[PDB]
Design a protein around this ligand. Structure first.
Ligand SMILES: Nc1ncnc2c1ncn2[C@@H]1O[C@H](COP(=O)(O)OP(=O)(O)OP(=O)(O)O)[C@@H](O)[C@H]1O
Ligand SMILES: CC(C)CCC[C@@H](C)[C@H]1CC[C@H]2[C@@H]3CC=C4C[C@@H](O)CC[C@]4(C)[C@H]3CC[C@]12C
Ligand SMILES: CC(C)CCC[C@@H](C)[C@H]1CC[C@H]2[C@@H]3CC=C4C[C@@H](O)CC[C@]4(C)[C@H]3CC[C@]12C
Ligand SMILES: CC(C)CCC[C@@H](C)[C@H]1CC[C@H]2[C@@H]3CC=C4C[C@@H](O)CC[C@]4(C)[C@H]3CC[C@]12C
Ligand SMILES: Nc1ncnc2c1ncn2[C@@H]1O[C@H](COP(=O)(O)OP(=O)(O)O)[C@@H](O)[C@H]1O
Ligand SMILES: [Mg+2]
Ligand SMILES: [Mg+2]
Length: 1210
């Protein structure tokens, strides 16, 4: 029992054949524009739940049986798609039958004596044949399009189901670029094959059936015609083989582009802060140029392919007629037969003119078939590698050796330990020694070479990089679980989240943002912890959850949650710690260096050892929503869009294209009438050579027609490339120029959609639609001009026939357009969900929530399909209506000719029928193509949207540009400075007033969520000042072009962000300076040893956004990045967060030596590294509290004293 079910199920037989059931929606759509709400629920068999499981099953049955073939696996959609063959057969015989009846009528009308009754019968038999072919043809087309739709669901369903199981090593090879490409473009390639796959036999049948009529007419002279056509195949064959290589290279360039764009949109804040977006712009363009260069070559071959097929029947015709006179000198010599022979030849263009699109589709689909087959055949991480015994030690690892990649050398070298039930274990060691690795090994994320691993009970995971969903804070803490009011409140207060829940705008239920961009580092880490704690599992793997928060909250969380008095007192919990404060509280602590456990034991036991760790210890010891969903445009498409696409093509090509179209269709009409005038001439003994004279002229025009067709097919293709190139550059510049607030609002999939699918539409579709539209347009003008001039008194018939076609076209398109918008809008969540999942697969797999996320994906794809399905039915609805109107007019033209056979104008009236069918079929084509054009241009409308938006301040002002040596003394002055993140939200900073003098070392201290990171975000002018101003050395900041600002001051941001490419590229993407400078920087960064010992020294492939190396190494890469610029104002935003105590001591000593003369302000939680500084700023919520020298603030016994006492400096 559905609330709004599809009417197709309940529809009677008469309704189903004519598609009468969609009538109701089409009328509703005309009155007021269609909404997402009044779309019908899908049919049970059109649903991911019913479609995808049978495909993945067949893959399990077929892949397990084996190489693994994907083509044999596409017998899943075979059964349903066979009926299509039967429907296509009947239609072709009815197409063949049509002309026969028309000959008998055109003959009947001529013969005066013929009985009254026999005339009507022919017209009645014509009308019925036209109706039957229409109904049968559109049953065929509906089966083809429904098949295509079901293949789209399954391809997306399978790819998502696979993405959650694939190995890490395979995840590096199959990048996010390929996965997004597979779900988007390759599914559209299979959908487009679904139509034309049925022509592979329908064209040869039609070619044979037309050829046999010539044998019946001519005889054994039709062989030459077959000999010419068979010789043709090899050319199209080798050219198709050549294209197959171009399509592969084109797709590879498209994957690389989408992969790079993903890495840009991930870390856009870092691009904005370092002022790097021009470097990454140039890189995206370089990849686009390669992709477009190949697409041009593919288009050149298509033109040669089209050129070959269009001029085949004329070359066949001349080849055939030569055979007669070169042997048959005895019997045959006819004059009129030529006309019937040419009338039989001129049908052999209708099959051959649709062939190069069949070839293009099959090649394009065959590439996509290989790419999907290669992706679904990747090695799957096996969960039976770990024992996972039912709820005697908690976890046991015995001589286990794990490796990130199968062929690479192992990370963990023969580790051996056992942890008892309800034991608090700690993991310690150097930066990049394999701690996060050890936790990954127990989750079966890493491949193991040898050993034995047993993990008894359910596992809960807290990763080092916090992963938060787009949904409300409560729903993040729940993570798809039933709510317990007692326990929920008990977890939230234990995780120290109450003050954070107070400061948030709408308290608990706030739209948290796409990657938790709203929250601060500590808030993200606390939510991530709270989720895992709420889940209530047997074993707890905590990857440094007390890093980002200060000493106060850290202690609170340790006493209330993790420690032996908290919630998790009884559960086995293995935490990775860098702090040495809580090691006496631990049961056993495991030290590891270079992937080997150096020594295990308790605090006292390890102290008694007098080892390396002992020596280490001595030295240091109604709710407000944020994300706005995509919303469809309401009215008609504005001429601005069309004019913008045409402006990109250029004036020269547009005047050439139209000119060649005219030359083509003029030659078409000259040939048309020159033949029809040649027809009605007597066969006298004279005009013996005239036939051999004029058939050369017919051949010449046939070649001329072919040459021009090749011409305009080329002209439109190059036009399309110019447009597609220009549109991408405008889109990319518009995106890179927008402010940070826009990116925090707009969903990720919202942009991925426009950069992948909407651009792929602009690249491929629109040129083909333009070619077919212009073709149909000039065909209609060409028919109209002929009938009018042949019968000047037929000027009355044209308007009425046009007006009724126009009103059907204007009615239909109004709804058709809106359905294409709804579909195009509703596909954005599908990308967002894919993007959200791929980041947090480790977490999803740890909590075993796969089924829920898989089930969520199915429900998100259903919405896209619910929007798509009415669109294709509406196409069928229109087509049947227009053809049935066409049949009616043909009947009246046909019936009028029989009624008034001999009354008057007997010679003229007989022909009236002949072109009454022509004009009908051409006006039928014009409406359908004009609609297809209006629905396709929506893609360009969608790309334009980010032109009329909010833009960031001008990059280069070039008038008020400050001197080359502007930051000469780092004198930073804040004057009544106040920041506000949104327009409606309350102020984060207010009435800030400090004077940081030149070369002054300034600390910034405060409680988590005090406005520390926001102050540094404010200085770079990422968010524009609400009140007051900042001044850097007697020069106002708001005035200057922010690229003159941003190059002169450096920051180490809180989150370390690396981009996909060589390790050298991350340090310097402009390629400005030498390798000696990079090496001396990596020497000061303390990565020299690590980066030197690597297989490729500085050409190491950092992939997936720097997942190839550890968090603490990304910290040092971001340090090196800052060390290379060597500016006079430096800003540290917790640069020493996820590192050792030893490693921290080093990079501090670096900062003291290198940045000795330049102004440095540092934000920090480790107060150890502040007490050395000259002055310190302390701020609580939005205002600066007591500030001065650290020694002074300790004497005062105020706030800074309280924070020092927690750290244990006092
Ligand atoms: N997914 C991965 N693919 C390939 N190599 C990896 C991967 N993860 C880690 N490594 C390599 O293993 C080394 C150390 O592993 P790991 O990241 O577990 O260190 P860690 O102890 O977590 O360090 P940190 O203290 O920075 O958290 C790194 O130097 C890195 O090159
Ligand atoms: C005689 C005519 C009318 C019918 C035969 C012509 C067509 C259907 C034939 C001739 C050459 C053939 C192509 C030759 C090469 C390729 C590339 C391959 O990777 C996929 C199949 C594909 C694309 C073939 C499909 C069928 C094909 C296009
Ligand atoms: C170089 C050549 C091919 C460029 C040709 C550009 C042509 C095809 C463009 C420019 C303006 C466009 C038209 C603008 C207005 C409408 C009305 C709409 O209800 C149907 C589409 C239709 C009829 C468009 C069809 C495509 C169009 C005619
Ligand atoms: C109609 C008959 C008489 C003449 C036909 C000549 C045709 C085939 C010629 C004349 C001018 C030519 C065009 C001139 C300019 C360009 C731009 C170039 O970057 C790609 C090829 C392209 C698009 C050419 C394609 C072929 C072309 C259209
Ligand atoms: N992009 C944002 N949009 C709206 N509010 C934000 C944003 N970033 C941070 N906030 C809010 O401002 C407060 C202070 O943030 P911030 O100064 O960045 O944290 P911290 O001082 O801990 O580094 C936080 O409690 C947070 O809720
Ligand atoms: Mg780690
Ligand atoms: Mg911060």
């Amino acid at each position: 029992n559905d609330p709004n079910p599809c009417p197709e199920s309940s529809a009677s037989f008469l309704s189903r054949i004519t598609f009468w059931w969609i009538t109701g929606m089409m009328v509703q759509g005309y009155r007021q524009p269609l909404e997402s709400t009044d779309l019908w629920s899908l049919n049970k068999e059109d649903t991911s739940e019913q479609v995808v499981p049978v495909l993945v099953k067949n893959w399990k049955k077929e892949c397990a049986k084996s190489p693994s073939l994907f083509k044999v696996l596409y017998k899943t959609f075979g059964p349903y798609f066979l009926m299509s063959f039967l429907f296509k057969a009947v239609h072709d015989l009815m197409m063949f039958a049509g002309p026969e009846i028309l000959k008998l009528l055109i003959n009947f009308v001529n013969d005066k004596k013929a009985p009254e009754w026999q005339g009507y019968f022919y017209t009645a038999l014509l009308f019925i044949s036209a109706c039957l072919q229409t109904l049968v043809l559109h049953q065929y087309f509906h089966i083809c399009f429904v098949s295509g739709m079901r293949i789209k669901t399954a391809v997306i369903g399978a790819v998502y189901r696979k993405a959650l199981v694939i190995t890490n090593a395979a995840r590096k090879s199959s990048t996010v670029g390929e996965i997004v490409n597979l779900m988007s473009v390759d599914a559209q390639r299979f959908m487009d094959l679904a139509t034309y796959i049925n022509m592979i036999w329908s064209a040869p049948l039609q070619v044979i059936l037309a050829l046999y009529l010539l044998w019946l007419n001519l005889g054994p002279s039709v062989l030459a015609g077959v000999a010419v056509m068979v010789l043709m195949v090899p050319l199209n064959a080798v050219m198709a083989m050549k294209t197959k290589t171009y399509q592969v290279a084109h797709m590879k360039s498209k994957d690389n582009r989408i992969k790079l764009m993903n890495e840009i949109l991930n870390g856009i804040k870092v691009l904005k802060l370092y002022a790097w977006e021009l470097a990454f712009k140039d890189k995206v363009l370089a990849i686009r140029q390669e992709e477009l260069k190949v697409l041009k070559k593919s288009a050149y071959l298509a033109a040669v392919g089209t050129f070959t097929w269009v001029c085949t029947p004329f070359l066949v015709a001349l080849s055939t007629f030569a055979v007669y006179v070169t042997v048959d000198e005895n019997n045959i010599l006819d004059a009129q037969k030529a006309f019937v022979s040419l009338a039989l030849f001129n049908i052999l263009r209708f099959p051959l003119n649709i062939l190069p699109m069949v070839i293009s589709s099959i090649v394009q689909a065959s590439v996509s078939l290989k790419r999907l087959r290669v992706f679904l055949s990747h090695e799957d991480l096996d969960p039976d590698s770990i024992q996972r015994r039912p709820i005697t030690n908690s976890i046991t690892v015995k001589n286990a050796t794990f490796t990130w990649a199968r062929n690479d050398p192992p990370t963990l070298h023969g580790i051996t330990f056992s942890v008892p039930e309800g034991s608090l274990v700690a993991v310690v060691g150097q930066v990049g020694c394999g701690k996060s690795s050890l936790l990954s090994a127990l989750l079966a994320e890493m491949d193991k070479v040898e050993g034995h691993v047993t993990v008894k009970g359910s596992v809960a995971y807290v990763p080092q990089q916090a992963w938060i969903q787009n949904i409300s804070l409560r729903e993040n803490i729940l993570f798809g679980r039933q709510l317990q009011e007692r326990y929920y409140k008990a977890v939230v207060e234990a995780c120290a989240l109450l003050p954070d829940l107070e400061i948030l705008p709408s308290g608990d239920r706030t739209e948290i943002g796409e990657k938790g961009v709203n929250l601060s580092g500590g808030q993200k880490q606390r939510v991530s912890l709270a989720r895992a704690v709420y889940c209530d599992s047997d074993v707890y793997l905590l990857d440094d959850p007390l890093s980002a928060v200060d000493a106060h909250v850290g202690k609170h969380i340790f006493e209330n949650v993790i420690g032996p008095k908290g919630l998790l007192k009884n559960k086995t919990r293995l935490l990775v710690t860098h702090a040495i404060s809580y090691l006496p509280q631990m049961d056993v602590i495991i030290v590891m260096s270079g992937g080997k456990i150096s020594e295990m034991g308790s605090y006292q036991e390890l102290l008694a050892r007098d080892g390396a760790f002992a020596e280490f210890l001595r030295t240091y010891a109604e709710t407000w929503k944020l994300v706005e969903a995509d919303k469809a445009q309401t009215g008609q498409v504005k001429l601005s869009v069309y004019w913008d696409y045409m402006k990109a093509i250029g004036l020269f090509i547009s005047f050439l294209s139209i000119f060649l179209f005219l030359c083509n269709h003029v030659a078409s009409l000259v040939s048309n009438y020159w033949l029809s005038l040649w027809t009605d001439d007597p066969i006298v003994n004279g005009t013996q050579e005239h036939t051999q004279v004029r058939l050369s002229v017919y051949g010449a025009l046939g070649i001329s027609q072919g040459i021009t067709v090749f011409g305009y097919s080329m002209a439109v293709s190059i036009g399309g490339i110019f447009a597609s190139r220009r549109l991408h550059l405008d889109l990319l510049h518009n995106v890179l120029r927008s402010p940070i607030s826009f990116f925090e609002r707009t969903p990720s999939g919202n942009l991925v959609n426009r950069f992948s699918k909407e651009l792929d539409t602009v690249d491929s579709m629109i040129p083909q639609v333009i070619k077919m539209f212009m073709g149909s347009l000039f065909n209609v003008i060409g028919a109209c001009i002929i009938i009018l001039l042949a019968t000047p008194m037929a000027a009355v018939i044209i308007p009425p026939l046009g007006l009724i076609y126009f009103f059907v076209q204007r009615f239909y398109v109004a709804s058709s357009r809106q359905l294409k918008r709804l579909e195009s809008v509703s596909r954005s969540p599908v990308y967002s969900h894919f993007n959200e999942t791929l980041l947090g697969v480790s977490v999803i797999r740890a909590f075993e929530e796969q089924e829920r996320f898989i089930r969520q994906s199915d429900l998100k794809v259903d919405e896209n399909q619910k929007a798509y399905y009415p669109s294709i039915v509406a196409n069928r609805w229109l087509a049947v209506r227009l053809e049935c109107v066409g049949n009616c007019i043909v009947l009246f033209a046909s019936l009028f000719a029989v009624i008034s056979r001999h009354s008057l104008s007997a010679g003229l009236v007989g022909l009236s029928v002949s072109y009454s069918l022509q004009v009908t079929t051409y006006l039928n084509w014009l409406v359908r193509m004009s609609s297809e054009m209006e629905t396709n241009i929506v893609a360009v409308e969608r790309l334009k949207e980010y032109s009329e938006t909010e833009k960031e301040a001008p990059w280069q002002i070039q008038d008020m540009a400050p001197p080359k040596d502007w930051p000469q003394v780092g004198r930073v002055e804040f004057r009544d400075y106040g920041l506000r993140y949104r327009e409606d939200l309350d102020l984060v900073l207010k009435h800030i007033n400090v004077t940081i003098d030149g070369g002054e070392k300034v600390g910034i201290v405060g409680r988590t969520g005090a406005g520390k990171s926001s102050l540094t975000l404010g200085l770079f002018r990422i968010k524009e000042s609400a009140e007051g101003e900042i001044i850097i050395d007697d020069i106002n900041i708001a005035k200057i072009g922010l690229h003159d600002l941003r190059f002169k001051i450096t920051i180490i941001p809180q989150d370390p962000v690396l981009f996909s490419g060589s390790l050298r590229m991350n340090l310097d993407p402009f390629s400005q300076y030498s390798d000696e400078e990079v090496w001396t920087s990596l020497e000061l960064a303390h990565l020299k040893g690590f980066v030197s010992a690597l297989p490729d020294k500085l050409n190491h492939e950092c992939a997936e956004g720097g997942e190839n190396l550890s968090v603490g190494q990304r910290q040092l890469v971001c340090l090196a990045r800052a060390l290379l610029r060597k500016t006079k104002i430096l800003v540290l935003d917790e640069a020493t967060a996820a590192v050792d105590l030893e490693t921290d001591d080093l990079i501090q000593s670096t900062i003291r030596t290198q940045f000795d003369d330049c102004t440095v302000l540092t934000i920090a939680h480790r107060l150890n590294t502040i007490m050395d500084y000259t002055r310190v700023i302390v701020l609580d919520k939005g205002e600066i509290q007591e500030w001065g020298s650290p020694s002074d603030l300790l004497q005062q016994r105020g706030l800074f004293y309280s924070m020092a006492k927690d750290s244990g400096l006092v």
